[PDB]
Amino acid sequence: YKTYLLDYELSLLQQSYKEQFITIRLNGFIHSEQTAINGIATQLEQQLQKIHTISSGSLTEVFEKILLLLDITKITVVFIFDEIDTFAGPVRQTLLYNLFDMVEHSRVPVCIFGCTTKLNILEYLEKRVKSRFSQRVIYMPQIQNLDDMVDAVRNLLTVRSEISPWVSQWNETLEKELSDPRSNLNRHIRMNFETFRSLPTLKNSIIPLVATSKNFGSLCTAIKSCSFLDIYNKNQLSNNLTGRLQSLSDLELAILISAARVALRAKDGSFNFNLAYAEYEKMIKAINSRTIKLWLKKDVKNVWENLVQLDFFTEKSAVGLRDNATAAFYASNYQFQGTMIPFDLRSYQMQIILQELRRIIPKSNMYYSWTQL
Amino acid sequence: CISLGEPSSIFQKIFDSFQDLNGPTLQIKNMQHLQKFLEPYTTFVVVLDEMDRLLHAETQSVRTILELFLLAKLPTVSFVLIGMANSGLLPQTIVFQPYTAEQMYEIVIQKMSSLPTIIFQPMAIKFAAKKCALRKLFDVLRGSIEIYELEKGLNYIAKVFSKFRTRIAKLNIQQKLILCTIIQSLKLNSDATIDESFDHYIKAITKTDTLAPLQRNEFLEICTILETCGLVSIKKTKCKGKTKRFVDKIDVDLDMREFYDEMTKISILKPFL
Amino acid sequence: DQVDHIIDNIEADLKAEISDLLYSRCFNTIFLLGSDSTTKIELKDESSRYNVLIELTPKESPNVRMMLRRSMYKLYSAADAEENDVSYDLSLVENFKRLFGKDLAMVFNFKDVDSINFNTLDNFIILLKSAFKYDHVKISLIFNINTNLSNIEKNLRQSTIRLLKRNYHKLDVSSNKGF
Amino acid sequence: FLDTFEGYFDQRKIVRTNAKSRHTMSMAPDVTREEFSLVSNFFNENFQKRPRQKLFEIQKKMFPQYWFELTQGFSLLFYGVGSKRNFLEEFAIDYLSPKIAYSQLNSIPCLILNGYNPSCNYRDVFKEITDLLVNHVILQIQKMIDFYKNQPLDIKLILVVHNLDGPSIRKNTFQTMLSFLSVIRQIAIVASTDHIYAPLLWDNMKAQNYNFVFHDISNFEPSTVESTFQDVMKSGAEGAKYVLQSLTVNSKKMYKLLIETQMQNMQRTGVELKLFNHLCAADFIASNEIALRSMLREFIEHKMANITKNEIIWVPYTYAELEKLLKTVL
Amino acid sequence: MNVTTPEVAFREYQTNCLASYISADPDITPSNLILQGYSGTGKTYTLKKYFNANPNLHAVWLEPVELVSWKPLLQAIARTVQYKLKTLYPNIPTTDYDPLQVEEPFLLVKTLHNIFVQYESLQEKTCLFLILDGFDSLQDLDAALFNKYIKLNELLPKDSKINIKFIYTMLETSFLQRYSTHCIPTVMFPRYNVDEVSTILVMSRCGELMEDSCLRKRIIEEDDQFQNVAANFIHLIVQAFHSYTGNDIFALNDLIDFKWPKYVSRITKENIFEPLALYKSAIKLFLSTDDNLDLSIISKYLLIASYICSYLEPRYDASIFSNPRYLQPSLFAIERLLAIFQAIFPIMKANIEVFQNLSELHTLKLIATTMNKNIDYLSPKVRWKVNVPWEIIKEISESVHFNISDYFS
Amino acid sequence: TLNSHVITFMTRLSFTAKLFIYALLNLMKKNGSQEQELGDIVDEIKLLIEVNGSNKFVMEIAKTLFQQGSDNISEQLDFVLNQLLDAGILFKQTMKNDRICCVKLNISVEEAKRAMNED
Ligand SMILES: Nc1ncnc2c1ncn2[C@@H]1O[C@H](COP(=O)(O)OP(=O)(O)OP(=O)(O)O)[C@@H](O)[C@H]1O
Ligand SMILES: [Mg+2]
Ligand SMILES: [Mg+2]
């Protein structure tokens, strides 16, 4: 609740003092180093014409006009900076040095409200950038006890206005389930308090629970038994490593089991298609000796490529998704060694060890005897 | 050469400094466009200052110097090249000897010969000429005039060399305790970081039970004083173990002779050294 | 005089055999086993249908973005020379009927398949598969394989082999095909 | 075994550590750059000058035979022991140009390519071909192959590529550029290979377009032109004398005491960190103890006093040539 | 919330979740909606039928997979938004902007702000859904690309008559977990089982199989009867390829078309009413997948010597000529290859013919090296290695009558 | 300003976030490498749950952390992982695998153990 508190303060002041300040919003992910200069001049020409050019020319002439403007009453230039940790680079903080200079030396009232996620934001600044700062770091409070989450949910589902005849009946049902700790609403709140402890996270399930109700009778039923809440929790954990194993056939499970035994008995866990086919072939002849159709080597290629797309076999010493866009361009122009070698000699890694496969497989399956080693 | 934009465009500047502005201004690309202009002509003398910056910071680096050397070696033309670098067709190398004590003293009297009265002493210029062994001598003599005129000889030359153990006495007793633990962690662990130096300083002051400890957030404030004065150098390197990640390492740059002599005079700290 | 007549006769039967298999919601893959990418493919001039032959080289194909930009430049240049600036992407293929009025029949000729990277060629086939929902665009790929049909199969994904197998034919034309 | 495949596995035995030698470049006599060229130019013009001139006259009789192969579309590729720079410039100009211009009735222009120079780009070579004949480079040659097919057979441009084994020619971008031009029956290709892996560069698709003809002409040339492109003389004996000459008077005294102390017992490990401070106590040279870092950071930049703390320093330099340095600084 | 919820097969929970978020009122519509789900889960089918039954919602479809780089993605957003708003309200005179001027993430905010200012003449707030079918399928993908799109609504003016709505359809799972702290209502899509896959293919392929040209020409040479025939072939294909394909829809749809003409021609006047005799007559269409649809003498021997130098140590080579195959091959030298090649060659010096076959061996990608683009064969630091599997090198040595399995035994 | 909000931040976290920090510190006292992979933290968390599985007091939390109190939800093997990364406390290298990905601590080790004992 960082941007939500800042948006409420701007709306409260706009209902009385709408001609005394402007709104200048900035982002750390969208605006880069060079685009941050043009973003300030662009938001200034559109806000000055609304109360009663700047962003004209090259990049050098734009920054020159900004310093000549910021550096009966005045106009407060409220600066809303989002994700300020990206601009606090250890190489140079040009924008952070000029923004803080518009507070102490400059006479124009400039209110900078930075929003970041790093707890140690004081060390990310330079020696001169931190000198111009007032060291005003307001930490956002979190949920401590259990009664803090109950009062927040009650205030989000209580209609304090006479806009529907079912308002008086809905407030009695919500207050009855919340005051009783043995109800179903208090159980889901306590479960999310020790697992997530986030208000927007728990709000993702209350919204579809009310919209799916057809009438008032269906709303009071779903709010008392919480039947729809259990379905939402199962869907969120249906496409992970556990839900993907139940959607596999008999051959897709035999390949992943045989490939797990090779990486487990090895030293570094390296294996390829040739090592996985040797364990699968020795398992079919061992079971039938005590009829499973043994597939040829030309048919396992389609099953091997299907498990890679399903996030199960990761390449050995592979970075994968890059952080920023700089490392993503250099990695695309360089041809990796795994693309030149054939598919039967590519070193892969298992995303799940054999110890975890024995717990998510029931005893009714016939492939349970080959998961102990 | 340093007052240019590109090192490859050095042939165009010579054309603008020789050809008249009333005639047609031609464009010069390289050697083929500059040699044909000096064919009909008149001794063209050029002074290329600081030729060491003409390289492209071995095959492609030595290109502008090798091209300009070949232009002033072939006959049929008349183009001389005199460069002033900084320390069978090879140029005549002349090493400029530095000025000594007797060489710097003659230039002072020769430069100030136009002045009617000389307020300098013959024994004061002899000390500044030997201690500076020409640009360094000018800053010494100029500093003595500004100092003497701000407070209102032989002692005037000694004050310019002293006004421009001291860094330790300018610190507090609390900053000396952390500094003593910084060099101590670098002796029993060689490469150490800021996180490892803070743990060694806390465990070293707990056995003595003197002075209150400080948090990790305020630990960087003391190290910042040593970096501004010139006693602790903090750089950014990597690790050498299994987790070779980017981390901030701490280092020093002081002598061990002066360190084991200033803190021992207070006679209040012994196990911290 | 007889050698030059034989060389001219080699390309004569090669241009007739390729055109006989090119025009007689899938890709028309034609594998040219034993081709050094030195044959000039000439398409027919049928009415109400514009045919464009796009030749892709491994040197001019460094990535996927440059593969689509170079293919759209030759398409817009060939259609304008027969009979307003547009972007060089897949939007030109979709808006080909609204800007010209005739059908589209792109014939891709991948020169030197063994010298190109397989990680880039796989993404180009999947990107061109979305042009089948236009009901007026037909893409025909031509590969000049110089090794074997088994070496070019292991370097592709399962979604690429099954897609091109809907209408793929073999046409071995080496330097000594049957002596 | 010495020859055949048996000689490869017999001459690569596992040599023991104690059986190896420790002879470096310290015992070898040091030479300068002025005396290196005077002797080289003397041995390349007098030693075996008569057998080299007599052998060159024998290969000169093959000049009409080389021209007969270029008229039929067969490109020439000379090889052997030594360089072929003097053999190509004397044949492709003083014999190939007058004979061609007098058989198809100015002279025929010849484009000499410097393959030994690493700075031979592929965009500057094609610029002279278009201006004399009248990837955009590869697409331009393909448009001229079919255009020159209907033209009559008449040699108009001679390509004399020198050294077909340098770093610039061995690149795959430049090779295919020259093979496509060799298919033209109106352009003569005269190359010369020196590396032993010459046929490894071209394959079956490149040999048919090149149509090269091998001609062994081992003239045993010392190769004086291509030898001036690499660092043949390749920590600086003559370079260290110019550093001390530009320094001050007090700077030369600091290096004189370090050399005399290090060269006293070459088995002294060198000069310790605190050992250098003891020399200042007997000779007023430096200021105090904190001034040692001002002179230590300057000597290590010119490569003259390497550090090797197990602070004991030791510069990798023998005492054979170090004794002569004390006489110059004195 | 006034909207119509369509009826989707085996997607009762997924269809109800879309109606709880997507609405015509921006006050009860979230700014972000991720539709995570792997291939063959029905993400596009549950979205097209949801927007076709409700014509009051204006959604913009965009395929990021057709733009490769991220630069054309920013240009396609402003181009499709202006084109959609032009045909929606033709009685409003707006200014056409150049979509090619969007090259930076900041320029996208300025371009979208210059369009929403001329659409304030409306009465109620009209949503603008921007469906991004396949966000993670983009080529140049990074971890900072999704962070620039989830904060686009913050820079937009709150007092606007048209609010943008971003809809992402992810495919993998790890890409979604990287932004789990943003609290985005994600609608997962689980894969179908063996009972839902066959039921989907029946209700989607029966309308095109019984009216095909091959089946109509077979009954005249030899509508309720043709329905059970086409339904039996679909059920027999899934049960015979459930292990080869798994649960993918594209993998099973290709096998049906590849075996449909071969299954119609095997139907006579007696196999129309007896399904037992029809399965036995075409037993070759269910037991296998039917797959999918000249080397020189010196070139054959060069690949044999290259396989030995890449899978054996060179320290013991003076004892034979005078499982390591399961790992990556090793790099050797040119002179080390010609020594073994000359020993295994039957009764030859190294002439230009040997180097000619070796240069052609690298063109077909049969032997790898240390450099891919711009390789130097004359460089002494560039090594050579084999690039063929064991099954390929086994059939080559068998044609020349050479024992290649005894060297590794 | 001189106060440190890192200590009080970990004391107000949920049980899932506090268990990930306690599991990371326990792995450092066994091997001493300052580089624990992601696969070792998952195995160490499950090892602490099965310590007293026969007791009714410990099995009450196993049904929520692995099944969320539902019989239809299978036994699980991401919210608390990305939360500590943006707070400047935990670090994670760029790796496509979720088992061999090393996890390093950015804050001090002395101030991290004080928050676990306060709970
Ligand atoms: N529940 C269903 N009932 C009937 N047909 C379905 C169902 N789900 C999917 N389909 C069919 O599956 C076909 C192919 O699936 P489609 O490509 O649309 O799925 P997707 O999950 O959106 O794909 P992708 O991951 O490639 O984006 C569609 O044409 C659709 O008709
Ligand atoms: Mg925010
Ligand atoms: Mg889809």
Curated annotation (Swiss-Prot), chain A:
Q: Where in the cell is it found?
A: Nucleus
Question: Looking at the record's lineage, which domain of life comes first?
Answer: Eukaryota
Indicate whether Ubl conjugation appears among the record's keywords: no
Similarity comment text for this entry: Belongs to the ORC4 family.
Q: What does this protein do?
A: Component of the origin recognition complex (ORC) that binds origins of replication. It has a role in both chromosomal replication and mating type transcriptional silencing. Binds to the ARS consensus sequence (ACS) of origins of replication.
Additional facts recorded:
Present with 2170 molecules/cell in log phase SD medium.
- Name of the featured protein: Origin recognition complex subunit 4
- The organism named in the record is Saccharomyces cerevisiae (strain ATCC 204508 / S288c) (Baker's yeast)
Name the gene for this chain.
ORC4
Full-protein residues shown:
107 to 529 of 529
Swiss-Prot record, chain B:
Q: Which cysteines are joined by disulfide bonds?
A: none
Q: Which UniProt keywords apply?
A: ATP-binding, Cell cycle, Cell division, Chromosome, DNA replication, Nucleotide-binding, Nucleus, Phosphoprotein, Ubl conjugation
Q: Name one GO molecular function term.
A: ATP binding
Inducing stimuli: Transcribed at the end of mitosis, but in cells with a prolonged G1 phase there is a second burst of transcription in late G1.
Q: What is one term from the GO cellular component aspect held by the record?
A: DNA replication preinitiation complex
Reply yes or no: does the keyword Cell wall biogenesis/degradation apply: no
GO BP terms, alphabetized: cell division; DNA replication initiation; G1/S transition of mitotic cell cycle; MCM complex loading; mitotic DNA replication checkpoint signaling; pre-replicative complex assembly involved in nuclear cell cycle DNA replication; regulation of DNA-templated DNA replication initiation
| Location relative to the cell | Nucleus; Chromosome
- Report the PTM annotation: Ubiquitinated by the E3 ubiquitin ligase complex SCF(CDC4), DIA2, and TOM1; and targeted to the 26S proteasome for degradation. Phosphorylated by CDC28. Phosphorylation is a prerequisite to ubiquitination and degradation.
Similarity comment text for this entry: Belongs to the CDC6/cdc18 family.
What subunit structure does UniProt give?
Associates with the ORC complex and the MCM2-7 helicase complex. Interacts with CDC4, CDC28, DIA2, ORC1, and TOM1.
Supply the name of the protein: Cell division control protein 6
From which source organism is this entry?
Saccharomyces cerevisiae (strain ATCC 204508 / S288c) (Baker's yeast)
Instruction: Report which gene this protein is encoded by.
Output: CDC6
Which residues of the complete protein does this chain represent?
Answer: 172 to 512 of 513
Swiss-Prot record, chain C:
Superkingdom, according to UniProt?
Eukaryota
> Where is the protein found, in the record's own terms?
Nucleus
Q: Which family does it belong to?
A: Belongs to the ORC3 family.
Question: Its biological function?
Answer: Component of the origin recognition complex (ORC) that binds origins of replication. It has a role in both chromosomal replication and mating type transcriptional silencing. Binds to the ARS consensus sequence (ACS) of origins of replication.
Q: Oligomeric state and partners?
A: Component of the origin recognition complex (ORC) composed of at least ORC1, ORC2, ORC3, ORC4, ORC5 and ORC6. Interacts with ORC6.
Q: What name goes with this protein?
A: Origin recognition complex subunit 3
Q: What is the lineage of its organism?
A: Eukaryota, Fungi, Dikarya, Ascomycota, Saccharomycotina
Q: Which gene encodes it?
A: ORC3
Swiss-Prot record, chain D:
Q: What is this protein called?
A: Origin recognition complex subunit 2
Q: In UniProt terms, what function does this protein have?
A: Component of the origin recognition complex (ORC) that binds origins of replication. It has a role in both chromosomal replication and mating type transcriptional silencing. Binds to the ARS consensus sequence (ACS) of origins of replication.
- One GO BP annotation here? pre-replicative complex assembly involved in nuclear cell cycle DNA replication
| Origin species | Saccharomyces cerevisiae (strain ATCC 204508 / S288c)
Q: Which residues span the membrane?
A: none
- Which family, according to the similarity comment? Belongs to the ORC2 family.
State where the protein is found. Answer: Nucleus
Keyword annotations for this protein, in alphabetical order, are: DNA replication, Nucleus, Phosphoprotein
Signal peptide annotation: none
According to the record's subunit comment, the protein's assembly and interactions are:
Component of the origin recognition complex (ORC) composed of at least ORC1, ORC2, ORC3, ORC4, ORC5 and ORC6. Interacts with MCM10 and TAH11.
- Full protein segment contained here: 239 to 617 of 620
- Give GO MF terms, alphabetically: chromatin binding; DNA replication origin binding
Q: Which GO terms describe its cellular component?
A: chromosome, telomeric region; DNA replication preinitiation complex; nuclear origin of replication recognition complex; nuclear pre-replicative complex; nucleoplasm; nucleus
Q: What else is known?
A: Present with 1700 molecules/cell in log phase SD medium.
Q: Principal place where this protein is found? A: nucleus
